[PDB]
Amino acid sequence: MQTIKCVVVGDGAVGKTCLLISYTTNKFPSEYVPTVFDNYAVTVMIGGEPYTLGLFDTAGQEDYDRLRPLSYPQTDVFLVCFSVVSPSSFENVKEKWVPEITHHCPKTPFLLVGTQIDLRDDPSTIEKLAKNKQKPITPETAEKLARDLKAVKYVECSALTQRGLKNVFDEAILAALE
Amino acid sequence: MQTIKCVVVGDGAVGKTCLLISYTTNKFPSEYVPTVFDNYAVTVMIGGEPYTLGLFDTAGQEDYDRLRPLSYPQTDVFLVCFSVVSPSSFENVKEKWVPEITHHCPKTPFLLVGTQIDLRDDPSTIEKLAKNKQKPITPETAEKLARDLKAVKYVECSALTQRGLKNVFDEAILAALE
Amino acid sequence: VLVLFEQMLVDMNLNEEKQQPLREKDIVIKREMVSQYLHTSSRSAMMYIQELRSGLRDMHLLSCLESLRVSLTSHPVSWVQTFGAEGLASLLDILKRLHDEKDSRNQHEIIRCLKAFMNNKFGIKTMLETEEGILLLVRAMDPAVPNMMIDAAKLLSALCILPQPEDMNERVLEAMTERAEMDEVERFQPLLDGLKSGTSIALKVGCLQLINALITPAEELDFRVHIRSELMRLGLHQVLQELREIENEDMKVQLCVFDEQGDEDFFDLKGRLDDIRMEMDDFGEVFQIILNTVKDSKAEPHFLSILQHLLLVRNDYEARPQYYKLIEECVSQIVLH
Amino acid sequence: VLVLFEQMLVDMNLNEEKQQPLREKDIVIKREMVSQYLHTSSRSAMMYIQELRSGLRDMHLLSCLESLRVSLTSHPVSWVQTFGAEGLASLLDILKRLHDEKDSRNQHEIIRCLKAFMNNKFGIKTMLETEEGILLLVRAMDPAVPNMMIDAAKLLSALCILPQPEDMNERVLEAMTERAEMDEVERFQPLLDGLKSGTSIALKVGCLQLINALITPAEELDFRVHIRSELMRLGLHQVLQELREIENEDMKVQLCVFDEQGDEDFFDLKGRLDDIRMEMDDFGEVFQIILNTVKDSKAEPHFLSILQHLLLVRNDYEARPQYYKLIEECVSQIVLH
């Protein structure tokens, strides 16, 4: 079956699987299970026309670094994820992820996706970061990284509340259709 | 000659002499000369009646600690001075000055006088203090110390600009007249 | 039918644990994987050696290196094979060039390449067979470039742990002597500069890890105390008070390994001192050991110098017993930590 | 006519400089001064001794002490005379009582009294004649109470400077040994706790000042090196790096005095080592000095223990020369700073 192939990458525990489960099933898995690779599929109506989206979930672990590229052939769009409450994952978008997808799929577009956006105003999360001299990534910081790495655009979401979640994938279709 | 005897005490370089020169002569001595003891005199009209004020300038140095008390006999009012840009002098109002005048002249009133008030908003002065983890004394801090040490009230002035200067001595007369 | 799957798993550098969820995927998924594995077999390794020899500089070198790193990380171990010694050699030549000319990003990136190169059997083997490989790793331990140091340190730490070639900790130490004697500095100075307060916790953790990795595999108690007191001399004891404070799970595990080893070594060396104190109870006994054992040795000049240093205080001094009691405490803390 | 003026000036504890502007005031002002001096001669000293013996506690003790301090500061030296030994004794008894019962404000205030008491000839003399005076000053050096420590330290520093009674620095040191051997701690520990980063600059300045004052008057080079290395052992060397940083005019003058003395002492002791190295060029020579000079001495047990500590490393060890070279460096830094 032909689809808009959309591959999802980013550090472990950034929230990729949840983002996929939450979007495609409307449920949030409570338990964490590190993913090797999984396929998902959705249908999105655009102006009364069906558009079919093939969603490839990949491993955030370094141990599957050599396995991941098997998900890459003939990709139409990438989602490069980081958690807005993990400056660590934000940095790896730049040192690891973008150079990785660029290498395997040059000139195929990608979106910068900010995740776990509901925890950006959580005081418990904010203080944990502050103890490490760290702070959440603001939308405006992320938009700056997007322009610098030549991403199509920056989108953000919470998988828990689903805020901004539909938009991620509507924007992914648009990027893949250009 | 009988007068309202007013004695002025406080750390060296707090601005007592200037305060006295500035008030009684309308001039500001540029040069600094540590005072041993000096007398000054002014006439103040209150409701069309002359009131005569005897002003006793004392040494801020510790070296004249045993000389100062000669200024104290039959005092009607004390002015206990500190510079609002010297937290050091503010502390000595409590550890040294008030207990000293109390000892020699119990139950004779005193005013808490904040000096050099023009330097409270001087950025050069503020930063010098901040480098030492210090800050200017705000009027509200000083008013709190006044109530605690049972001063008549807190007054403040700049001798350089003369702002609040007349009021100090009008308030000193009032305290001495009660 | 599943034979090409077996090799794929090995070619993706996965242990038995990480293979497990892949072995459970049905034949249908396995069949699609092997095909997309055969398809993925980007420019070749040959082109990278080409570029590494083509005199790249600053920004243009970095791009190349960033692109090589991805290849070394993401491609099958077999691609790494093709890169091999030849590629490692040219990769190490550039590292040298960079040292010979007054970017730390270029230096850092080669180490990032080296890290990916060495996460597999072949990579470590090939690195070990280099004449200048381990020295260049030691030289990358710049406290001024914390992230590179962490990466160099961690690789270096994994080599000391290696049982397969014997005395890898001595091979690392050897290399640290070599870089010290060209830089004209103490061999353990970078490790200690890394432990100064102000440096990152990750770097602090890295330095103690290497320190531990150098000391752990050493079977000889003299070796352990020897390098430990060389550490102690450069002020390790006091910086160690500082780290005992910072609430980090990774620092506590490294301090823990260090302290446990220092304790066991204390016990042993104290046992040796109790024994010397039983047998050699006066000067005659002790002098005979020095004449038999130290005199006419390579150790003679240094031991003589220690003796001489102990005799600068005058006979007359009314408090020499007290002075010597204090010197004794100092010497004691030096020998027995 | 001006005869009562002369005594007034002496009674107000003023040196020739501070008297000068008062000697220039015309007879008219002088005449009014002597009268108001004769008038000022507040409750008497007798009443204060009364209260100091009357079992005051907490807040009520403080008031009394605050009131005594003013008297001791502001009244003529002759009032201080009336207080005298008797008053000092009872003032020192309370200080002891306070130590014997688990306010640091009451302790601090007695020192503030002591400070005023001692700014005059009579005060210092009377304090020196006490059996427990100088010990109680040393005991007031609590790093937990910084301001009291600064005050105690500064008084203690002025005593070491004193030429008039001989060896005042040794009298202070003696007292510091006495408080160390009741507290069960190192004698110079408070001085070093005061120099830790986190403490005030004023306290840091105070501690170095005392350190300097203990070392400066000492004529014997062995004494200076003796106490300096006792300092060094408790980590003075490393805390000294820290203070070399902080931009304060008062700290720089104290570091400066210390460094200048340590330098001159280094020079001298290095000269002693050059001489020992010329004469005692081998083991036989050196052994004879030990037998003649250390054996059968009070120094024997400690020197023997140092020797024994040097022999824990095995004969077999493949790197003992190197080890002993490292120990030599350590011993050298201990003996020669």
Ligand SMILES: Nc1nc2c(ncn2[C@@H]2O[C@H](COP(=O)(O)OP(=O)(O)NP(=O)(O)O)[C@@H](O)[C@H]2O)c(=O)[nH]1
């Ligand atoms: N509050 C909050 N938590 C989230 C959100 N999305 C994910 N999480 C939490 O983050 C954890 C990891 O999620 P997961 O999707 O498995 O991450 P991953 O990126 O797939 N990891 P891996 O790459 O290793 O499979 C889970 O415990 C989940 O509860 C979100 O939007 N909000």
Ligand SMILES: Nc1nc2c(ncn2[C@@H]2O[C@H](COP(=O)(O)OP(=O)(O)NP(=O)(O)O)[C@@H](O)[C@H]2O)c(=O)[nH]1
């Ligand atoms: N900006 C500013 N400087 C002031 C003010 N009053 C005094 N000064 C400065 O403070 C310094 C000392 O003032 P002075 O009156 O001599 O202090 P003092 O309190 O008499 N000192 P002493 O007790 O030793 O005689 C002078 O250099 C003067 O310029 C003021 O109102 N504003």
Ligand SMILES: [Mg+2]
């Ligand atoms: Mg996942």
Ligand SMILES: [Mg+2]
């Ligand atoms: Mg004045």
